[PDB]
């Protein structure tokens, strides 16, 4: 029977490429050949955060645009000021191997987690006024590689052991389990709705998951090794994904298929992290060359460069209103880009 | 009127930064380990002898070790090896001798050696259950490593007293399987310390200790232009 | 989406010889080391063979030396096995597996769990 399955589902996956490829009348490259190029893009260091020991893994962006969140290997999460330069908070950690952190949508809570596979979730408003953990949540097996923050109550997270999860952080108990990955899962991504999530996973695939139901809607593939980060377009129809292959490619969650690929002849490095600007044009990734690189995300075109880190670039971010890029690096320094 | 909270993030920052700077103190003389090992090595033995992951502190000679165990993570090691890229060392746990395990300990010691990320970080190899390997020697490895059939124990070995010369053989060919890698592709930047340890043996602890002291000695010999 | 077809296999009597191949297909197979690897009936998986991406370095398990020998043809993405003289030991499931990550010397690919660059596999009763 076992051979008959695997048949019949070799069946179905060529049923799914011919009705993809029944759909790619034109590519994405033979449409925007008529549009005006970004031009050079020449973005410059206005503030540098310093004050991590280890190498930084995590970033996030509140939404105020004004206050960031990151975490070093250290164990300490810190609260930035990105228009002051000054520190808010200084969180001691109970482990030092924290892979991911998250900033709440209303800036209440902090959450991070990492080798521990626990998410340990931060109330940064208290009465004492003293950093406080208000939930650890636990029941993954493996490692946590990222955390992402629907309201004050919930948060989707996804963990080295090839699932995803959505936690009711007032009960502390898990509530929706999103399995079907092979590989680690190593970033999420929330659609601007925050009904829908993207997952991408240690398999060259990525998979559009729905929050409500449990159920994933859509898998996509054409990465050759794993992928590192995935983010979702402003509009909330695509997302970018990045991976160990020197690739960024442009996923349409619409046409369920591939639409732009993002390489260079010179990138033989992976993608650590990928964000896009607000208005969708630009399309920003980190690399393993020090360095981050802006593409122009309708055209596949390199339109600057952000040099700056002396180690791995391991985190980026863009503020939700758009003024300015902050990444981090393995050499324990934030920097932000305008 | 506003500039009071200016003021007050100032004091803030004069807080933390305090805070950081005994951090520093603290984070900078700590010597951070990482615990690997074959499915079979006494890995919690070595924890021993004194969730996702364990720790283990020590104070050897008022310097502060802090060792961690990988817990129940998943045997997918590409991803979460790349965090420990900036500990002192890796204490590679490796028990001699159903597969053949000390291939795919080679495998994973070749893998973790010639990492992008690990370039700069040196290996302590325990090679374990020494006593286990005498007893199945002196009773094989050619039909595992044929070459053994031509090896001979190098005139440098100091073999403990009262072992077989078979055994001996077997030890120093399996420590020479680890160290052709260990040479053929270090540069220099990392080295690897072979030891040959017993199931119950305290001295362990001293030969973290050691090793450690010797891999922060060259490290800077190296950068003085010394060594 | 990446794919590993092993093909080749089939019963032998000891003493006899297969040829295997690979046909590998959603990737640049140029940049990346291959393996083979078997699961015995009763053991896990090991690793037996690893071409370098060029096929200027070649090893094998100390018990396959002499007996098995493999190549990989750039031009049609396929990787082989020549398996001679072989022994009632060498009965096991093999797959073509590749490393994760492009231009690495390094790769984590014979774990138990779900590997994802890894093929279905072919019988090889001896």
């Known amino acids: 029977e076992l051979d008959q399955l695997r048949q019949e589902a070799e069946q179905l996956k060529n049923q799914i490429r011919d009705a993809r490829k029944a759909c790619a009348d034109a590519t994405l490259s033979q449409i925007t050949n008529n549009i005006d190029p970004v031009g050079r893009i020449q973005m410059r260091t206005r503030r540098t955060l310093r004050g991590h020991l280890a190498k930084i893994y995590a970033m996030h962006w509140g939404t105020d645009s004004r206050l960031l969140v990151s975490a070093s290997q250290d164990g300490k999460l810190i609260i930035w000021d990105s228009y002051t330069t000054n520190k808010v908070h200084a969180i001691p950690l109970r482990s030092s191997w924290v892979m991911t952190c998250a900033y709440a949508p209303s800036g209440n809570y902090v959450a991070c987690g990492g080798l521990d596979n626990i998410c340990s979730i931060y109330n940064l408003k208290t009465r004492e006024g003293n950093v406080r953990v208000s939930r650890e949540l636990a029941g993954h097996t493996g490692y946590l590689s990222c955390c992402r923050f629907l309201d004050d109550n919930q948060i989707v997270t996804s963990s080295g052991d090839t699932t995803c999860a959505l936690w009711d952080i007032e009960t502390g108990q898990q509530t929706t389990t999103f399995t079907g990955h092979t590989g680690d899962v190593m970033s999420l991504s929330l659609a601007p709705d925050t009904r829908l999530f993207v997952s991408g996973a240690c398999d060259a695939s990525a998979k559009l998951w729905d929050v409500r139901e449990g159920m994933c809607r859509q898998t996509f593939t054409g990465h050759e090794s794993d992928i590192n980060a995935i983010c979702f377009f402003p509009n909330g129809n695509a997302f970018a994904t990045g991976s160990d292959d020197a690739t960024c490619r442009l996923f349409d969650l619409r046409a369920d298929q591939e639409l732009m690929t993002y390489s260079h002849d010179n990138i033989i490095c992976g993608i650590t992290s990928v964000s896009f600007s607000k208005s969708g044009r630009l399309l920003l990734a980190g690399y393993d060359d020090f360095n981050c690189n802006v593409w122009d995300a309708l055209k596949a075109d390199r339109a600057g460069v952000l040099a700056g880190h002396d180690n791995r670039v391991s985190c980026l971010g863009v503020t939700d209103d758009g003024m300015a890029v902050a990444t981090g690096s393995w050499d324990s320094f934030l920097k932000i880009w305008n | 009127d506003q500039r009071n909270e200016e003021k007050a993030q100032r004091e803030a920052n004069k807080k933390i930064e305090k805070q950081l700077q005994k951090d520093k103190q603290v984070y900078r003389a700590t010597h951070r380990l990482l615990l690997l090992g074959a499915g079979e090595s006494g890995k919690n033995t070595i924890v021993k002898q004194m969730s996702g992951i364990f720790e283990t502190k020590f104070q050897v000679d008022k310097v502060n070790f802090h060792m961690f165990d990988v817990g129940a993570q998943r045997d997918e090691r590409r991803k979460w090896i790349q965090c420990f890229n900036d500990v002192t060392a890796i204490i590679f746990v490796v028990a001699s001798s159903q597969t053949n395990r000390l291939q795919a300990a080679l495998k994973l010691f070749d893998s973790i050696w010639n990492n992008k990320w690990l370039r700069d970080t040196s290996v302590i190899l325990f090679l374990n259950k020494q006593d286990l390997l005498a007893e199945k020697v002196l009773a094989k490895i050619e039909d595992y490593f044929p070459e053994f059939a031509r090896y001979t124990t190098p005139e440098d070995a100091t073999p403990e007293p009262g072992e077989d010369p078979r055994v001996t053989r077997a030890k120093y060919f399996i420590r020479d399987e680890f160290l052709r890698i260990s040479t053929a592709s270090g540069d220099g930047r990392h080295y690897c310390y072979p030891h040959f340890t017993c199931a119950v043996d305290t001295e362990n602890i001293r030969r973290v200790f050691n090793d450690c002291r010797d891999i922060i000695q060259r490290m800077h010999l190296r950068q003085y232009e010394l060594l | 989406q990446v794919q590993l077809q092993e093909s080749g296999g089939g019963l032998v009597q000891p003493g006899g010889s297969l040829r295997l191949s690979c046909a590998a297909s959603?990737?640049?197979?140029?940049?990346?080391?291959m393996n083979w690897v078997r699961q015995a009936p009763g053991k896990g998986l090991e690793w037996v063979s690893d071409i370098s991406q060029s096929g200027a370095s070649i090893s094998y398990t100390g018990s396959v030396k002499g007996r098995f020998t493999i190549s990989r043809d750039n031009a049609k993405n396929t990787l082989y096995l020549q398996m001679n003289s072989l022994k009632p030991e060498d009965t096991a499931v093999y797959y073509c597996?590749?490393?994760?990550?492009?231009?690495?010397?390094?790769?984590?690919?014979?774990?138990?769990?779900?590997?994802?660059?890894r093929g279905q596999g072919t019988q090889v009763t001896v």
């Open positions: 959603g990737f640049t197979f140029s940049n990346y080391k």
């Open positions: 597996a590749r490393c994760p990550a492009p231009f690495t010397r390094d790769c984590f690919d014979v774990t138990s769990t779900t590997y994802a660059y």
